[PDB]
């Protein structure tokens, strides 16, 4: 689920007959977005053939063709040429906005804040995660409109960086929520619990958990030539492909709308309960409004992405095997991933810039 990694073709019908070897000119591996695993044989003509890797003969041909160097799959070219309509400006403006915001936050924390609190360490780590995301964003913007101009190891490292940034930002949001919970409900306990060394320890553990979750995506992703153009995507082995697919679409979902949302409704609930002790209407109303804004923004910017992922994975359930419905679902996945990019690029302005002490540091750095 990197840049929606929309494959050129996903086909759902196999062959019941044998195809000769002389009619097999090139081989292509279907991405993980397909409902079922398959391999596409490009013949002498532009017409292509599909085969399921569960066969015994398909292995023989897919090996013989690469040792040297039926039905037609529904080409997902309209998806790209509609993506080519307005993907690039959207990706570019999101990238530049998030980049300037994250550099602002990091420079502020370095100059004015000097990392005095554990919240500062968490904010710096979240900004670094967003920066890692935004470093990969334009590289995928350049792949949406044109063929992949990089190699296998390059797109693999880029996938690694992308998923590392995503998972680390998702975990650091939870870490900031837990820090706020410990500061509001257990302030006298947080005075001895919130330490910078514990913050760095939890940040390192979060980074290693994020990279450990990303490694399944890194090893199961490669770049291959589909005709003239190149594409890098996730290709799981046909032995347990669906299973791995499920695992993939489970993990993000488990970290998309289950774990962070429960952490939020557990922590911010107690925060709002304790806010009754504030006895300041102008402050209490603003705090509840900010909490509700964070909740609703996280929902509006993450729920459609996990929903569309669940749509694309479980195709037997709510059957959408029609390739036109597949094109609509892929466009929905693209727009929802871009919505998640907007969420990650506006999380700095919603977690830091809303604070008055942060705005003071910013205006001090400005002058």
């Amino acid at each position: 689920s990197l840049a929606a990694d929309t494959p050129t073709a996903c086909c759902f019908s196999y062959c019941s007959r044998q195809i000769p070897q002389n009619f097999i000119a090139d081989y292509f591996e279907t991405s993980s977005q397909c409902s079922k695993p398959g391999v596409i044989f490009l013949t002498k003509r532009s017409r292509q053939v599909c085969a399921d890797p569960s066969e015994e003969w398909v292995q023989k041909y897919v090996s013989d063709l690469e040792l040297s160097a039926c039905s037609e799959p529904c080409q997902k070219i309209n998806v790209k040429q509609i993506a080519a309509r307005l993907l690039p400006p959207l990706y570019s403006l999101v990238f530049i906005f998030g980049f300037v915001g994250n550099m602002l936050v990091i420079l502020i924390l370095i100059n004015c804040k000097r990392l005095k609190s554990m919240t500062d360490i968490y904010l710096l780590n979240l900004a670094i995660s967003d920066l890692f995301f935004l470093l990969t964003v334009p590289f995928w913007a350049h792949y949406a409109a044109a063929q992949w101009d990089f190699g296998n190891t390059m797109c693999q490292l880029l996938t690694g960086l992308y998923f590392i940034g995503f998972f680390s930002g998702i975990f650091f949001i939870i870490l900031l929520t837990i820090d706020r919970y410990l500061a509001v409900v257990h302030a006298v306990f947080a005075l001895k619990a919130r330490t910078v060394t514990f913050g760095v320890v939890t940040s390192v553990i979060t980074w290693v958990v994020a990279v450990f979750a990303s490694l399944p995506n890194i090893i199961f992703t490669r770049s291959q030539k589909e005709g003239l153009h190149y594409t890098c995507s996730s290709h799981f082995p046909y032995s347990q492909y669906q299973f791995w697919k499920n695992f993939q679409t489970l993990k993000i979902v488990i970290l998309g709308l289950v774990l962070p949302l429960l952490v939020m409704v557990i922590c911010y609930s107690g925060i709002l309960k304790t806010l009754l002790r504030c006895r300041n209407e102008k402050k209490r109303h603003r705090a509840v409004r900010l909490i509700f804004t964070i909740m609703i923004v996280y929902f509006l910017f993450w729920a459609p992405y996990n929903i569309v992922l669940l749509l694309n994975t479980f195709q037997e359930f709510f059957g959408l095997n029609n390739c036109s419905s597949s094109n609509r679902l892929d466009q929905a996945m693209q727009v929802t991933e871009t919505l998640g990019m907007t969420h990650c690029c506006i999380n700095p302005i919603i977690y830091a810039f809303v604070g008055e002490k942060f705005r003071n540091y910013l205006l001090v750095f400005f002058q």
Partner: protein, 216 residues
């Protein structure tokens, strides 16, 4: 460069110890005492836990509080009041019985107004304490409150006089939204008086943490 490396490692030792001491200071709570005639806060000092500045340390409910009594400083207050910038809260003790003695209540009020409306203590709160309540009852039902306040709460009873004194003390805080004053009347049991201090300190820490994270 053995000497240079030794000096750098000694600087690292000193910086590590300084960071540890700073964490210790941030963990503990620093409180301030102020009063017209007696800022020693005998009500709080009477607790069993317990030369110009008097330092009193006591841990309550897994929280250490340091209190600084400033009474031996007969010099100008504005010349050294900036040193206490950054404290948790200021505990202002006012004797309720010191309302008819002479101007003393007026001096306490002007001191409270000058301290609360100071540019160096805008964010810090004020834990106001009213001492001598049992004697205040005798004084208020034996002598009228018109001596100090022209309005004197109208009814001129203990409850009304205490309420009017509290509202008048809160009237001096021009920074209503910025600064919140926690007013309390001292009790015979020191445990309730220290529990109020703990609650006020917890509220101040809540405000500070919400300003740190960004909710406030």
């Amino acid at each position: 460069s053995a000497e240079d490396k030794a000096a750098v490692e000694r600087s690292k030792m000193i910086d590590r110890n300084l960071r540890e001491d700073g964490e210790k200071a941030a963990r503990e709570v620093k409180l301030l005492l102020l009063g017209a005639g007696e800022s020693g806060k005998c009500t709080i000092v009477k607790q069993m836990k317990i030369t110009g500045i008097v330092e009193t340390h006591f841990t309550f409910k897994d929280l250490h509080f340091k209190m600084f009594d400033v009474t031996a400083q007969r010099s100008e207050r504005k010349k050294w009041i900036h040193c206490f910038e950054g404290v948790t809260a200021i505990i202002f003790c006012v004797a309720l019985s010191d309302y008819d003695l002479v101007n003393r209540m007026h001096a306490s009020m002007k001191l409270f107004d000058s301290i609360c409306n100071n540019k160096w203590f805008t964010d810090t709160s004020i834990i106001l304490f009213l001492n001598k309540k049992d004697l205040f009852e005798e004084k208020i039902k034996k002598s009228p409150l018109t001596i100090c306040y022209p309005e004197y709460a109208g009814s001129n009873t203990y409850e009304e006089a205490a309420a009017y004194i509290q509202c008048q003390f809160e009237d001096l805080n021009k920074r209503k939204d910025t600064k919140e004053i926690y007013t309390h009347f001292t009790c015979s049991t020191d445990t309730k008086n220290v529990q109020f201090v703990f609650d006020a300190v917890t509220d101040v820490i809540i405000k500070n943490n919400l300003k740190d994270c960004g909710l406030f």
